[PDB]
Amino acid sequence: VPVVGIVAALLPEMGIGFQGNLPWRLAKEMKYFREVTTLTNDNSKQNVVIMGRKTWESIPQKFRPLPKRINVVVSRSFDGELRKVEDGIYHSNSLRNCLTALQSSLANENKIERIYIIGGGEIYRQSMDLADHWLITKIMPLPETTIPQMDTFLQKQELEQRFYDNSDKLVDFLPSSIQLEGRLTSQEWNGELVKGLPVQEKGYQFYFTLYTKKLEHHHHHHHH
Numbered sequence: 001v002p003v004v005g006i007v008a009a010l011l012p013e014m015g016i017g018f019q020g021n022l023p024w025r026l027a028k029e030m031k032y033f034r035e036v037t038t039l040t041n042d043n044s045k046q047n048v049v050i051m052g053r054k055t056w057e058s059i060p061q062k063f064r065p066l067p068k069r070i071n072v073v074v075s076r077s078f079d080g081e082l083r084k085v086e087d088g089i090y091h092s093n094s095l096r097n098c099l100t101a102l103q104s105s106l107a108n109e110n111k112i113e114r115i116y117i118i119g120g121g122e123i124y125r126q127s128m129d130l131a132d133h134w135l136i137t138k139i140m141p142l143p144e145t146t147i148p149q150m151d152t153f154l155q156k157q158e159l160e161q162r163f164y165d166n167s168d169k170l171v172d173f174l175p176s177s178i179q180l181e182g183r184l185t186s187q188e189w190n191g192e193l194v195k196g197l198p199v200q201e202k203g204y205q206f207y208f209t210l211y212t213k214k215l216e217h218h219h220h221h222h223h224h
């Protein structure tokens with residue numbers, strides 16, 4: 001089961017939140033996030049969404065737990081490494097231990113396709129060492145638009161050490177049933193190269209991107 005971090009960030013600093021909320025409201029960004037985390041290649045499988053305690057608390061109480069997805073809320077105050085508390089809601093007290101629990105094919109019985117880390121920021125930092133892929137929505141304010149104030153940021157440094165821009169394989173990576181508008185485009189913005197599928201809403205133009213783990217040198221395999 002692949003571990004995939006999914007996030008929406010504003011370039012160049014990659015800001016993700018402000019005072020417990022999203023610094024923007026974009027219908028086409030939500031539509032993408034919902035479909036990616038919901039849809040699967042195996043019709044009898046469901047994905048898992050993992051979030052920190054604070055991210056859970058800001059999701060509209062009408063729309064949580066997130067429908068058609070197994071929800072996992074991680075807080076250090078909780079009891080076990082994975083615990084069912086309500087219908088489709090799981091409580092965990094360790095992000096690392098939670099991942100190991102779902103990955104063991106005894107517990108899941110091969111009914112989980114992907115583990116999406118919907119994150120938080122404290123979770124996102126810990127996800128750099130954990131996630132295989134990253135689905136990053138690179139958002140740019142249009143020439144007239146004002147940059148919104150933000151207090152939570154994605155580690156752009158830790159990301160570009162361990163991951164490369166694999167946006168060429170985005171359509172292949174996303175579930176087959178998903179619908180996409182534009183086509184793969186490269187674009188320079190404030191220095192850096194922005195590559196992905198271009199969408200425009202309100203005063204923002206954003207790109208859906210894919211970041212895969214870089215190739216590892218074979219240093220040591222655990223022999224018995």
Ligand SMILES: NC(=O)C1=CN([C@@H]2O[C@H](COP(=O)(O)OP(=O)(O)OC[C@H]3O[C@@H](n4cnc5c(N)ncnc54)[C@H](OP(=O)(O)O)[C@@H]3O)[C@@H](O)[C@H]2O)C=CC1
Nearest residue numbers: 008017021022052053054055074075076094095120121122
């Ligand atoms: N644009 C985007 O893509 C997204 C942005 N956001 C933004 O993120 C911001 C919130 O930031 P942040 O506070 O970092 O959000 P988090 O939900 O990541 O908050 C971290 C909390 O998760 C729990 N936690 C963290 N690490 C672990 C661990 N290893 N094991 C168990 N529990 C753990 C802790 O809960 P406790 O203290 O109870 O132990 C901690 O307080 C908001 O402003 C929001 O808008 C959120 C999601 C997506």
Ligand SMILES: CCc1nc(N)nc(N)c1C#CCc1cc(OC)cc(-c2ccc3c(c2)OCO3)c1
Nearest residue numbers: 006007008021022029030033058059060063118137
């Ligand atoms: C759509 C936001 C998003 N984009 C990307 N690219 N990756 C993500 N992981 C997310 C996310 C998320 C979790 C979240 C956080 C939140 O507060 C910060 C609110 C919601 C949310 C969930 C359902 C909603 C809604 C907002 O508006 C009404 O319906 C959902």
